[PDB]
Symmetry: C4
Subunit: 437 residues, 4 copies
């Protein structure tokens, strides 16, 4: 029943101001699941009587997946006015027709989802196409398309809060009734799992409906292990579009470095062949990641998205889970595309797979390796390391069994190296290059 929305009509109304002359373009930028269309619909339903004519569209992306762009703009003209479709086999005649016919009128037009600029150029991209008092609202997942246009104001919509999330989930799961004084702990766990994103609340609300308490705990365990693919598909829509390196940057951040320092992240990505100046800016642009106190923290569910995508890959390019380490010991197949590693606690193998993975002869079979992390305290059952291949960019090691680094090691454009081990005599015998740090 539109919970927490009334606080938004004031914010949207304030941006336009409703007393200025001419045309103003406002862009609503979200996250890909947070309330965007519902907010646009609320504004439409409140102010649609002030103008001579108004129109509203949903999911222009799907509309062009079923129809043609010329047809779409054909309907828009026939919606503002009551006239029937006018024949035009050329798009440009239609653009001139919109300019010539509806210039001397005040209208409100809402766009729901756009991804490329020719959409705006063919539909609403102008300044004098509309008369005085007209308002243009464009909803999109990234502000970049808005930036190329002359959008006066923009609004970024954040996730719901604890009280609002609980209220919405309670509304969906129990529309009339109330929990039988035994679901509060489960309520807290479920809502904490999502952390805003009302789409997830809607999906889970319809799932646990007239379901006994016996299935709720199983649902918690499944959600802990499985990403609940239904929401993951809607998030996956935003993933398609990254060209060559943004996927690698996003996968690197999601798999290993979620809340690390920015400067070291840019140093790593620049030294690894990616382009942080472009990749980081556009990833922030598309609301996949956000910067908070010089960190690159993302949403909880987006991390699960990246982890699942990394898992579904025939060559294991990202090993962080313990069982994937076991699968990587086959040999001659998975070594050539390891592209990273993350050693974990050893009380899951019970046969010495962990010691073999970082052994000398195992590391000679891999040739591309950038990230290697070993984070678990030494029990007293470790072995010295020999190879340390000549391709690493990020090094993290716990207690070091060996006396010092091997003499066959070259930094090889290293970036980050911290050693928490308490047994190191000297780092190196001489003074090597250390071009980057």
């Amino acid at each position: 029943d539109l919970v927490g929305i009334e606080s938004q009509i004031k914010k949207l109304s304030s941006l336009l101001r409703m007393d200025l002359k001419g045309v103003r373009l406002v862009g609503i930028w979200g996250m890909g699941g947070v309330g965007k269309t519902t907010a646009a619909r609320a504004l439409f339903n409140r102010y649609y009587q002030n103008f001579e004519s108004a129109c509203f569209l949903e999911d222009v992306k799907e509309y062009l997946q079923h129809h043609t762009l010329l047809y779409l703009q054909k309907t828009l003209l026939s919606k503002l006015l009551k006239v029937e479709f006018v024949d035009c086999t050329d798009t440009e005649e239609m653009c001139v027709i919109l300019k010539r016919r509806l210039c001397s009128k005040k209208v409100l037009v809402v766009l729901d989802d756009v991804n490329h600029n020719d959409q705006l150029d063919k539909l609403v991209g102008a300044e004098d196409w509309f008369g005085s008092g007209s308002r243009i609202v464009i909803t999109t997942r990234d502000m970049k398309l808005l930036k190329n246009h002359d959008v006066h104001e923009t609004y970024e919509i954040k996730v719901l809060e604890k009280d609002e999330a609980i209220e919405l989930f309670n509304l969906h799961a129990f529309k009339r009734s109330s929990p039988e004084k035994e679901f509060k702990e489960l309520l807290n766990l479920v809502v904490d799992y999502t952390g805003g994103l009302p789409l997830a609340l809607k999906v889970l609300g319809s799932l646990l409906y007239k379901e006994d308490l016996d299935v709720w705990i199983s649902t918690i365990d499944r959600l802990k292990d499985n990403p609940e693919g239904e929401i993951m598909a809607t998030l996956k829509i935003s993933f398609d579009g990254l060209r060559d390196y943004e996927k690698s940057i996003f996968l690197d951040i999601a798999c290993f470095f979620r809340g690390y320092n920015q400067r070291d992240m840019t140093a790593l990505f620049h030294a690894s062949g990616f382009h942080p100046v472009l990749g980081v800016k556009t990833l922030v642009e598309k609301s996949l990641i956000f910067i908070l106190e010089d960190k690159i923290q993302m949403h909880d569910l987006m991390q699960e998205m990246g982890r699942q995508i990394a898992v579904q890959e025939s060559p294991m390019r990202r090993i962080y889970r313990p069982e994937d380490v076991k699968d990587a010991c086959i040999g001659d197949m998975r070594k050539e595309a390891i592209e990273g590693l993350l050693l974990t606690e050893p009380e899951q193998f019970e046969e010495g797979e962990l010691e073999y993975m970082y052994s000398a002869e195992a590391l000679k079979k891999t040739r591309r390796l950038r990230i290697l992390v070993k984070e678990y305290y030494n029990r007293g059952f470790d072995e010295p390391v020999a190879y340390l291949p000549n391709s690493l960019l990020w090094l993290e090691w716990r207690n070091y069994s060996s006396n010092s680094f091997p003499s066959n090691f070259e930094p090889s454009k290293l970036v980050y190296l911290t050693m928490k081990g308490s047994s190191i005599i000297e780092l190196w015998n001489g003074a090597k290059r250390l071009a980057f740090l």
Copy 2:
């Protein structure tokens, strides 16, 4: 000519009762091929004159595969009334229009095939959208969508009986004439092969039409070996939708355990990483399996569906057929993804492949193994077993050649173990964990 249908109009009529006031929702839940649309059509054709207006749809799934949901509900309003299409570029205005326009009327509306709840919410999901006396009929393959709605009554439609199946097949194969007193044995074999499911009778009826007796026996042999893919595609439609573990549960049940005990099945699935509380409930929900006397018996054709799907897979994850055992002896490729086994009668190999498969060195190449079944009496040409890898969850062995279990065996969260062998001195030297049984 709608055989056996007259007994159903009474059952459907009784549920609504036809004398109550307000609106009542009835959900017809079937199996994916049993008569569902035909029953809905019979009810429609019998009671369509009682109401002011009525409408009927087929295969809403396909309709959205060709059109948009907004267009679909646009036609529904234009069907109840004689008015032309009304322009609305937003779905919500259309929902309000249905509520505002057709509230003060009594109508009958039938939905043929739905899969997601937003379909019902956008089309028929309400209580006061329709006037007094309105009836809503929703046909679907699973009652779960009905459960989220306030459906008053539900009806599950079962397969046809022996007499009805024979009558329908005779109608299709010989619409006017009669069998020439030589097809009765073939008639019994063909009808027994299907076992209800009038779709299979329709498919086979049109195939053996003006065909000589010489081809009938060949058809029986082909049907024994081949699953007759045409029907298998319609059943395959229901398979798509299972998220991650329901496919594994269904494949496990179809391949090995069809009529086993429920409790051991849930113990196996819970111990193997799946979620029986969710998977079993939803598989029963989607009418893929049913529970009869604490068993998990399914339909005969669904078993062939699962077996064929398991066969078409580049990594042989399910070996039950004898020739697949031969193909699994290549080595270094099929061992790493064996994920189960089923040894069969040895009078098909004639070269000792069976003894090599369970040999000591063969079992060291496989690391993931949950189910292993060996069911054939010992001729006197067997060999002792050595490895018995440390990953099994289900064990079944015939006469045991070895004296006792190897000392290198750990139960490894075992679940089921029965030994029909008559040569066992002691199970183990000591007392191990045996956490699960």
Copy 3:
């Protein structure tokens, strides 16, 4: 300009007879490229004035690939009559509407391309839907769909003759002008390459248009080596539809046995796991192969279709070309899926690859082998054979270097064995089974 067509209007007219009362169904069955639609159009254009109303469709397959079956039959009613589309969201109401409205009229209706029986049932499948004097023409690639209906007469259309093919090609290549007294030899070679099938003549006619003589010879060489994929796609349309074994039967016939004896072919296919009673009948049914003097001769272009399809396959299951033999000597990859062989002339290897292929140790790496043919006279540089694996079904060997068969050979349900070699003392030492021959 419709060459050779006038001889067909008489044949089609004679079948209906044009003086009978009631409704008659005639089915035109072709080959998949021979003139079918053009013949139907000629009959339509000649007799469309005799009836009150008439209609004609093209490529119902494509129409349902873009529209819905309900829409298709909606247009058919609106074509016979001048009335606008009538609303009906259920197909069955539309079928009853056709029966109720157009029963008392005489019409001519032509169907262009159908593949499944529900098309005919929903559109034209009845006897009293049409009034006296109505004619139904159904064009299809296989008579099986006609057989399930009560088609009175059928006509099979064959390829064009030498004179007609030359005339049509000359019309396409030189619509006004004439060859400059130097293209006659090239004309004969090109027309001989196609051998009828006016679609191929149309494709090649538009390709060699205002092209110099220098490119013509290159075109002949390319056509000799390349199958000219454009026509191959139209033929490929018919390939899709074979379920599991018809593809294997067709590939076996195209690759090796084109003009062999029928009885041995059925013996091979029955002994190899296929079903000749079904496969051969339906392949003849779909006009892929035809029987002439107890042979299985096919069209020339269909053989190139099968050969190309066999070539495009990552596992080399059909080796007949000489360079594929070289590619099959890699080892451990191609042996496990050889599924046949055809040794050819040895003056293309010049390094002894041919002798290695049939060597003893090479044949132990293959386990599935049915067809093996060795047809080239012994120069005096051959070696004795040792293994002769225990899976063959068809054997053909030239001059035999060895004295007799190896003692480790079992017939293994052999079917065909002829030996043209002049050096054989005895076939076997004893008397083995020889279950099939």
Copy 4:
């Protein structure tokens, strides 16, 4: 604002002449991104008032990807005249209707994008379908379709010049403002990267819009390394269509031989199994390559297209980049499909990978090899060569360490061989065949 276009209206106007009687067909042939539709639109907008009726279409390819050809020509008739759609379920009746109805009128019709001749035949393919004074304009990517028709004149549109490219990019990047006296060097580099092709200017203009100078240099580096896939997709559209050997010819030219001599190129392609008489002619025909001073120079961006396509391939069939050489040293996988090589400067390996690649034992693992180029001066750290496999067609070697060619070398239908080495005693001991040179 249509920069540089005014010089084109005169050229197009001159071809028709605008004073002749009858109908004339003019074909505009471009490159796949150069201004073609905009030029056609300019001519339309200037001369559309002279005729009774006129029509214009865009992207007929997409129109048939969403609609049917019959529907397309249905709209064309309803555009010239004001009448509503006329029912016709057969295309041929529609063609006769166009001939019968609009013959006695003068019209202007523009086709935007065609790929197959039946499009023209069904729409505009005739001479007397239109009255005196009618003009037909057909825009297409290749003149071959025009050649089959009776097109009187053709116009090929070239890329923009330096001044025009700078003006257009400045218009897109700064529509109102001007560069802040610091972007001139960046302007020159960006425009030089594209070299005409206004589509690339449009794409890059919208990307660097209100972007700081810090991101511009990163964009230059990314464009140097990445092909900017957005434009590459539009160019990729033209790639689809080449049948079997044109792709191989194009990949060979793009990867290695861009500005080489024509005659040696045709000799190589003819000797390698391709058909230069067909392949070269049609590649020039489709405006992928052009001939300049007996060279095969292409556009700069098309070379990046070919290089990227060659890179995205699981079997490395084209090794020219230095890191791909490292990836090709795995062994037993990449050797069997090397199909060419290009050795580069050795100050990128620093471990001796280059010497191993051309070593004796490495070359025995490859069996298909046509092109091998080694272009870097000998530092004094090279090794003699032994194998030189018996399959090469093109040889290029720098300073030769060995005394002479190995005695196990056969020319093997060699084509090109130049040796810049200064240490060669004799080419061969005797006189071998040397069939081709």
